[PDB]
Amino acid sequence: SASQTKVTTSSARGEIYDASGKPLVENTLKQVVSFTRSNKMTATDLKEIAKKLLTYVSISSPNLTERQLADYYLADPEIYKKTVEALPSELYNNAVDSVPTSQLNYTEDEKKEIYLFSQLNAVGNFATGTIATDPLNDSQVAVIASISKEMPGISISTSWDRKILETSLSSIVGSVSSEKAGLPAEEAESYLKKGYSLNDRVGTSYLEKQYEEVLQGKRPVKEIHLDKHGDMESVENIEEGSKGKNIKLTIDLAFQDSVDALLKSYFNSELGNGGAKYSEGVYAVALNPQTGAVLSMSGLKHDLKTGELTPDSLGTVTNVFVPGSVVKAATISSGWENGVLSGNQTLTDQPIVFQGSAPIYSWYKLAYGSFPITAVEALEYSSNAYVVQTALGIMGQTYQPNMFVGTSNLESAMGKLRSTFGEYGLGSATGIDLPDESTGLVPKEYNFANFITNAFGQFDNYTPMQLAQYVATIANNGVRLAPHIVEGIYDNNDKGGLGELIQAIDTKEINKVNISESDMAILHQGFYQVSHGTSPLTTGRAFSDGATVSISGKTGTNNTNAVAYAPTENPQIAVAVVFPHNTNLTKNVGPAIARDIINLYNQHHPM
Ligand SMILES: [Zn+2]
């Protein structure tokens, strides 16, 4: 029978780099007081160590918990034997812990040695823990190092402050927990199970959290074995510690910055002319449709209460917007999957009149009367009649003007429409490499009118990322890919910086949309004619106006959203622009913004 026990110490966190290698985070090296605890140190011994250490360190904002107050009170061996004396070893510690009031009389200078006592008390037997204090300077550290021998247990070691660098990707990088705030409390149990200490610093937000396993530094491990009582025999080493592995993003700072500037430019323009007065902002996501790589995620928040403009790149994955007409492709796709439409089917474009409700029109209203229209043309002219007749078909009915609609098949129809939408990413999880994306506002309580509006993008709300995946799906011929913001995992070179490739994050297929290849080609013809058409009803000629490459896309019609991919023949970029609640009917900047993003990218990475 011999006693076994192993202790661990954390290392430097890996760093985060943009597509070109610029660092986005900083490990600033610092020196800290460390404490190594022995099974032999009593609480009175620990008290004596705190008081000696208080002469050398500064303690500013001590926020002691009752648990800590009581531990310090009960340290006195005589006062512990007395407090349990009046009660009706671990169970005996906890019951005696509910026996004293925390209304104790400790001077402010007293509260300081209680804080330190706490820090020493938190360190497990034989382990080496950090003793959090105010920043120590070079001279202050040299004093402590020289008188360490007088406080057995105390030493000076090297730690690291984590800081985020001022860039447009600073919001996406996320946060890491302090060594004082320690391991996050509502998750403490699930980390201890993994191997983490109590005062470890771990990603609590966005990328730091998502790639925690990659960024966390490898630990140096030591074993200690115990004799008879459980006392230290010798201190043997198992594993030598190293800096965490690095991650490189798919986003390039230069490009991201130029998209932010372009969004601000268009937003102010629209704000100035009054069109954007009640608009919450403008968001843009550009993806690579062959891989799912995220090329930029930009956002500009306009506060409707003060008026201020602030960056909001996370809005692309957390905020939801009515999509408008850009979703017409997904509704037509649903008609094909549910046997309502056959290839490029001709419908009458007519006002849609249901009993007990206002007629439904398209943007051109009555200007051309009723006329035959194909699926290609339905996308090109952005026809509501077409998608409304399609939706009504999914519900099992043929449109006749003035019809009373039976709603016996409404849950089934809505389910089928949303199911198709979900295949494109609209209302479902995108797969993106962040801990918590919104999946959109998809209401479970709805009626017939809602089902119909949903068909032309006027009910379910989606995020800008979902809308980008949708059009990247069309660009990738129906094969929907998980977006990823990280490109590969990287080693470190000789002095803690971007070394060589460990594991390139590879493409992930999620599903393939259940439509024919020729049906997918009909959606491609539609999206092309939106931008290249010659009809008075053609809706997106602005996509082509000064384009350096051939753009295909779809406008959203209040609402000035747009989606696009390019080049048409061999798509390498797919973009979604979300510009909610813009009242300018005159000129539609949605397509213009998407074109410019695509031009921006083409100038940066030639296609
Ligand atoms: Zn051993």
**DSSP string covering 407-449:** -TTHHHHHHHHHHHHHHHTTTS----SSS-----B--SS--HH
**What DSSP string describes 84-149?**
TTS----HHHHHTTSSS-S-----TTHHHHHHHHHHHHTSPTT-EEE---S---HHHHHHHHHHGG
Return the CATH class of domain 1-9+219-241.
special
Apex 581 CA angle, 577 and 583, nearest 5: 110
* Ligand 1 centroid from CA 124, angstroms: 19
Burial 72-92 (b: 16+ CB within 10 A, else e): bbbbeeeebeebeeeeeeeee
Catalytically annotated residues: 325
Distance in angstroms (rounded) separating the CA atoms of residues 414 and 553: 26
| DSSP three-state, residue 16 | strand
Place of tokens 């349990």: 84
CA distances 297 to 261, 301, 432, 523, 598, Å, are 13, 13, 12, 26, 14
For residues 293 and 472, give the distance between their C-alpha atoms in angstroms, rounded to a whole number.
11
The answer to whether residues 191 and 177 touch, using CB atoms and an 8 Å cutoff, is no
Cα–Cα distance measured from residue 438 to residue 462, given in angstroms and rounded to the nearest whole number: 8
Strands 246-249 and 16-17: parallel
Is 156 within 8 Å of 162 (Cβ atoms)?
A: no
Residue 192 CA to residue 177 CA, distance in Å, equals: 15
* Strand 498-504 with 509-512, pairing: unpaired
- Residue 606's Cα: distance from chain center in Å? 29
Among 181, 179, 257, 247, which Cα is nearest to 208's? 247
Q: Is there a common fold for 10-36+126-218+242-249+487-506 and 37-125?
A: no
In eight-state DSSP terms, residue 175 is -
103: number of CA atoms within 13 Å, CB side? 1
Contact 310, 303 (CB under 8 A): yes
CA distance 285 to 265: 17
Q: What angle do CA 510, 514, 517 make, to 5 degrees?
A: 110
How much is the CA Rg of the chain, to the nearest whole Å?
A: 32
Q: With CA atoms as reference, report the closest residue to 595 among 510, 531, 538, 513.
A: 531
| Three-point CA angle 286, 570, 338, nearest 5° | 80
CA 65 from centroid of its chain's CA atoms: 33
| Packing angle, helices 66-73 and 110-121, rounded to 10 | 90
What is the whole-number distance in angstroms between the Cα of residue 237 and the centre of ligand 1? Answer: 8
Partners of 562 in the beta sheet? 555, 577
Q: What is the CATH number of domain 10-36+126-218+242-249+487-506?
A: 3.90.1310.10
Question: What is the whole-number distance in angstroms between the Cα of residue 223 and the centre of ligand 1?
Answer: 6
* Calpha distance 104→582 (Å, rounded): 62
Taken in order 598, 603, 604, 607, the sign of the CA dihedral is positive
Q: What is the C-alpha separation between 415 and 418, in angstroms, rounded?
A: 5
Quick one: tokens of 99? 């026996």
**φ, ψ for residue 286, nearest 5 deg:** -120, 125
241 in Cβ contact with 128 (< 8 Å): no
| Phi/psi at 6 (5° precision) | -125, 135
* Separation of CA 238 and ligand 1 centre (Å): 8
Within a 10 A sphere around the Cβ of 567, how many other Cβ atoms?
Answer: 17
Q: Ligand 1 center to residue 9 CA distance, Å?
A: 17
3-state secondary structure of 386: helix
Which residues make Cβ contacts (< 8 Å) with residue 352, sequence separation at least 6?
A: 359, 360, 384, 385, 388, 389, 399
Measured CA angle at 137 (ends 133, 142), to 5 deg? 100
Query: 222 alpha carbon to ligand 1 midpoint, in Å?
Result: 9
Interruption sites in the chain after residues (C→N beyond 2.5 Å): 88, 557
CA distance 468 to 287: 7
Q: Which neighbouring-strand residues pair with 309?
A: 302
CB of 576 within 8 A of CB of 474? no
The rounded distance, in Å, linking the Cα atoms of 215 and 68 is 32
Residues 552, 528: contact at Cβ < 8 Å?
yes
- Two structure tokens written together for 358: 């206002």
Residues 6+ apart with CB under 8 A from 425: 466, 467, 469, 470, 473, 480
Distance 240 CA to ligand 1 centre (A): 15
Burial (CB count <10 Å: 0-12, 13-18, 19+), residue 58 = exposed
CA-based nearest residue to 599, from 569, 570, 575: 575
- What's the 45 CA to ligand 1 centre distance in angstroms? 29
Type and span of the H or E element at 372: strand 371-373
What 3-state class would DSSP assign to 574? strand
CATH number of 250-486+507-607: 3.20.20.100, 3.30.70.2740, 3.20.20.70, 3.40.710.10? 3.40.710.10
Residues paired with 29 in a beta bridge: 160
Cα 506 from chain centroid (whole Å)? 19
Please report, for residues 79, 182, 214, 312, 597, the alpha-carbon distance to residue 211 in angstroms, rounded to integers and kept in the order given. 48, 18, 5, 22, 29
The CATH code belonging to domain 37-125 is 1.10.10.1230
What is the residue-wise DSSP string for 274-291?
TTTTT--EEEEEEE-TTT
Burial class (CB in 10 A: 0-12, 13-18, 19+), 29: exposed
Ligand 1 centre distance from Cα of residue 127 (Å): 16
Contact assessment for residue 335 and residue 386, using Cβ atoms and an 8 Å cutoff:
no
Elucidation technique: X-ray
Residue 4 Cα to ligand 1 middle (Å): 8
Whether 383 contacts 530, CB under 8 Å: no
Burial class (CB in 10 A: 0-12, 13-18, 19+), 311: middle
Exposure of 5 by Cβ count < 10 A (0-12 exposed, 13-18 middle, 19+ buried)?
middle
Question: DSSP state, 293?
Answer: B
3 CA to middle of ligand 1, Å?
10
Say how many Å lie between the CA of residue 225 and the centre of ligand 1. Answer: 7
Distance from the CA of 235 to the center of ligand 1, in angstroms?
Answer: 9
d(CA 586, CA 542): 13
Those residues whose C-beta lies under 8 Å from the C-beta of residue 282, and which sit 6 or more positions away, are: 263, 266, 267, 299, 300, 577, 578, 579, 593
In units of Å, what resolution does this entry have?
Answer: 2.3
Dist. CA 158 → ligand 1 center (Å): 27
**Rounded Cα–Cα distance for residues 252 and 450 (Å):** 41
Domain range list for the chain: 1-9+219-241, 10-36+126-218+242-249+487-506, 37-125, 250-486+507-607
Residue 473, CA atoms < 13 Å, CB-side half-sphere = 30
- The alpha carbon of 226 and the centre of ligand 1 are apart by a number of angstroms equal to 10
Q: What are phi and psi of 407, to 5 degrees?
A: -110, 20
For residue 224, the CA-to-ligand 1 centroid distance in Å is 7
- Alpha-carbon distances, residue 255 vs 249, 598, 600 (angstroms): 13, 11, 8
